[PDB]
Recover the amino acids of this structure.
RNA sequence: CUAACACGUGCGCGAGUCGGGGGCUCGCACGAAAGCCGCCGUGGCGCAAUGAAGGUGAAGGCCGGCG
RNA sequence: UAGCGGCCCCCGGCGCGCCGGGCCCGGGUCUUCCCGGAGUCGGGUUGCUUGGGAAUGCAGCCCAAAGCGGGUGGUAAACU
RNA sequence: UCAGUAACGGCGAGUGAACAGGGAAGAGCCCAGCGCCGAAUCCCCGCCCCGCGGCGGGGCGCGGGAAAUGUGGCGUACGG
């Protein structure tokens, strides 16, 4: 039938072709570089872990996952950061277990 | 001008048009809107009902530009275009109808109030009302939406 | 280069290595006096980042500031007035301890100009900051085109006028909906612009 | 105290407003000084446009004004690159350039490209050395007719396109615009909850089948 | 005295009205005035109200065609 | 006093020429590499401030980071 | 101008911005880091030549020092 552009609805808005372009280089910040990963893992290897990080690692080792999440959230702050930190600590624990087994 | 003011005619009358019993003191009733609920309650209730209290929801970061939506009525609808347009459409025989765009003239919504002259019109707008739509259909014409 | 490694190290302040270092230094700084010139930066990377260059005319002063808040200097209690102003010993200073340290260094060394400062250690009762100063009349900087801005008279006592990086943070300067209090130069300017009558000639 | 009848007023004169009062007795002098500075700069830049660099076409960023067209801050790098202008040379030959602006669409980009090409076709470029001209330069004869122009260069216009009067067909006379708007509003409002209901109905059907 | 509001009065224009801010006028005795802008009416007030809001948004009366 | 009136002195700015000194410099296409600011952000609490309202901004104390990350999207929270 | 508006307030007295829009003006840039160049960098003392009342330019010094715990050139999010 008739499909007139409208100011309301799912497809609201004046129609116009949208041109693709390379994203601005400023959006690239935070992307992990190979050399930076090398440096960060070297520094982690020489330094170690924070006391709260190792306490949370013990909690994950005894497999109290909810306790680990709650403790990390309290110790660090936001739930998103807590989830990311818990995932990285579980990855570290898995790597350590695999190395010990092999 | 100070020439025409009441003060000039008031010189010599001790009192200055403010009474002898009750003088002209500083602030007999309190400053500003004081005593709105205590000793000016009668006046406030008699002349400004609904002054005290709360009602409705709070909208924090209000932006009037989102809600900007000027309106036009059908009696004014033919004034958007020139008279020569309307008369040419009137004495035209091919049945062609002129196109009136209210967004170009700065209106967003068309509301149907007035009587519409009997000739086809292509009204294109952003928002319409049911009565305006039915008026346009009855007079013969088309309603077109734009974004 | 080695700097990146250093920086990633200093970010790991809870590691035992850095913790031991910080403990030892803090002990040394506490043993020393309240304000004294350090021979060289303790954080070469941080001094680099803030603007230090290892050339003649750049000096670094290490200073300590007593920790805590700010209690109201009133005789016993006696902050006479309405109860809303009765507070004495839970108030907080409007400027940071870093800014206080920079201003103390600038006041002591009136012939130099403060560039920036950084944190080097702390304890229960002290905070230790190293502050970079520049001698504006040394030829090594007066003949360098890109650093001779600091030799202009306009840049006298930046720490006292709140123009350094640490001092600026307390002024509430920013862009966006969070910083409407300082549209214009500052809070003073915004308040002035909002609190005058523009009595036009015609009205 | 309130009189018989009237409006409740809230005059904002409870501060020391009389100390901060901005009288405008220097308004004509300010206008004269601004004028004098304007003509002084216009004389200073001898053949160059008095207004300044050309600027681009932009749309106002609001439902209230998105139908209008402004003069922007400066041309963006995508437009300069596709018009064949170097970002550093544009500023010194008279094109305002900013790098912040993006280009979501293509119509605006093409319009500004046309604007830049017209500006290149129209400008007269003086020799870098008055004795010997160069390749990227204008010949001598039209230099004698180079003059300052007043106002903005190629001023912005909001041009409206007429289409002629059309004849009605029955196809668009059966279009229920008001009903269409109402169902569009309803669909936009109920889209998500309908999706969730469809999802739970699907998982319930899967559970029943299994 | 300034600002705000209300009402009454006088004048101009009138569904419109108003340059107050800016600009153009060889800046300058008066003149810091006066004139002009009209694709400088942005904008204000008015032309539409109602609802807390999502929103909606201002006549109809007679004959022929299936009382 | 008016006057694109006169005379004298001094300083400047703009152009022209000479000597000496520095400078060897750009654009497009393809291939390969590289790219970021920490006791800081952020969280809790306390106090002040703001029109900013389950905290606008600032500061003290405690906790304290990440790298497809981080900040913002004016009502607290999880998912997207 | 938005606007005495959104909002705050014994929600009482009172307080109270911002975005968009039109104008005045209009100008953009530089480091650290990441890397590449025999530290390729800078300050000062002695002698010679120029003018020196805003102490500079050129040359000669197996003259001194700073600086590798990092000076200079390329280079900074618009990518290089
Ligand atoms: Mg009497
Ligand atoms: Mg009385
Ligand atoms: Mg009595
Ligand atoms: Mg009185
Ligand atoms: Mg204070
Ligand atoms: Mg902060
Ligand atoms: Mg009375
Ligand atoms: Mg009255
Ligand atoms: Mg307060
Ligand atoms: Mg929300
Ligand atoms: Mg109003
Ligand atoms: Mg009450
Ligand atoms: Mg206040
Ligand atoms: Mg604005
Ligand atoms: Mg302009
Ligand atoms: Mg370097």
């Amino acid at each position: 039938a008739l499909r007139y552009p409208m100011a309301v609805g799912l497809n609201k808005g004046h129609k116009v072709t949208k041109n693709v372009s390379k994203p601005r280089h400023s959006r690239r910040r935070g992307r992990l570089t190979k050399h930076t990963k090398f440096v960060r893992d070297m520094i982690r290897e020489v330094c170690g872990f924070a006391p709260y990080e190792r306490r949370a690692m013990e909690l994950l080792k005894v497999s109290k996952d909810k306790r680990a999440l709650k403790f990390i959230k309290k110790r660090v702050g936001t739930h998103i950061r807590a989830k990311r930190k818990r995932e990285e600590l579980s990855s570290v624990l898995a790597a350590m277990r695999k190395a010990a087994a092999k | 001008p100070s020439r025409l003011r009441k003060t000039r005619k008031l010189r010599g009358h001790v009192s200055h048009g403010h009474g002898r019993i009750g003088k002209h003191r500083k602030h007999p009733g309190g400053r500003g809107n004081a005593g709105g609920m205590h000793h000016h309650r009668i006046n406030f209730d008699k002349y400004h009902p609904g002054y005290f209290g709360k009602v409705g929801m709070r909208h924090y970061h209000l932006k009037r530009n989102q809600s900007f939506c000027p309106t036009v009525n059908l009696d004014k609808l033919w004034t958007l275009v020139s008279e020569q347009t309307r008369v040419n459409a009137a004495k035209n025989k091919t049945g062609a109808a002129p196109i009136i765009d209210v967004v170009r003239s700065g209106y967003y919504k068309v509301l149907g109030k007035g009587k519409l002259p009997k000739q086809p019109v292509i009204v294109k707008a952003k928002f319409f009302s049911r009565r305006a739509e039915e008026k346009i259909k009855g007079v013969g014409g088309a309603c077109v939406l734009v974004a | 280069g080695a700097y990146k490694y250093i920086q990633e190290l200093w970010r790991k302040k809870q590691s035992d290595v850095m913790r031991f270092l910080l403990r030892v230094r803090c002990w040394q700084y506490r043993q020393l006096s309240a304000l004294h010139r350090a021979p060289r930066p303790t954080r070469p990377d941080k001094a680099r980042r803030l603007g230090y260059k290892a050339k003649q005319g750049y000096v670094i002063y290490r200073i300590r500031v007593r920790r805590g808040g700010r209690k109201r200097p009133v005789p016993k209690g006696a902050t006479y007035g309405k109860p809303v102003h009765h507070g004495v010993n839970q108030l907080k200073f409007a400027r940071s301890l870093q800014s206080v340290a920079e201003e103390r260094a600038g006041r002591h060394c009136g012939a130099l100009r403060v560039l920036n400062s950084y944190w080097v250690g702390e304890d229960s009762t002290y905070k230790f900051f190293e502050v970079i100063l520049i001698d504006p009349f040394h030829k090594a900087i007066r003949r360098n085109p890109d650093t001779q801005w600091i030799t202009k008279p306009v840049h006298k006592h930046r720490e006292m006028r709140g123009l350094t990086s640490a001092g600026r943070k307390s002024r509430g300067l920013g862009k966006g909906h969070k910083f409407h209090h300082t549209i214009g130069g500052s809070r003073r300017a915004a308040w002035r612009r909002r609190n005058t009558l523009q009595l036009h000639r015609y009205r | 105290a309130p009189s018989r009848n009237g409006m409740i007023l809230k005059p904002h004169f409870h501060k020391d407003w009389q100390r901060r009062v901005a009288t405008w007795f220097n308004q004509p002098a300010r206008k004269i000084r601004r004028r004098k500075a304007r003509q002084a700069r216009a004389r200073r830049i001898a053949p160059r446009p008095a207004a300044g660099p050309i600027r681009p076409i932009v749309r106002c960023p609001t439902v209230r004004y998105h139908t209008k067209v402004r003069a922007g801050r400066g041309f963006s790098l995508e437009e300069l690159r596709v018009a064949g202008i170097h970002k550093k040379v544009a500023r010194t030959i008279g094109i305002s350039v900013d790098p912040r602006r993006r280009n979501k669409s293509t119509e605006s980009l093409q319009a500004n490209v046309q604007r830049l090409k017209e500006y290149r076709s129209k400008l007269v470029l003086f020799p870098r050395k008055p004795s010997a001209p160069k390749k990227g330069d204008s010949s001598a004869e039209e230099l004698k007719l180079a003059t300052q122009l007043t106002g903005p260069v190629m001023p912005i216009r909001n041009v409206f396109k007429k289409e002629k009067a059309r004849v009605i067909t029955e196809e668009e006379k059966n279009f229920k615009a008001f009903a269409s708007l109402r169902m569009a509003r309803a669909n936009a409002r109920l889209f998500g909850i309908r999706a969730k209901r469809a999802k739970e109905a699907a998982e319930q059907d899967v559970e029943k089948k299994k």
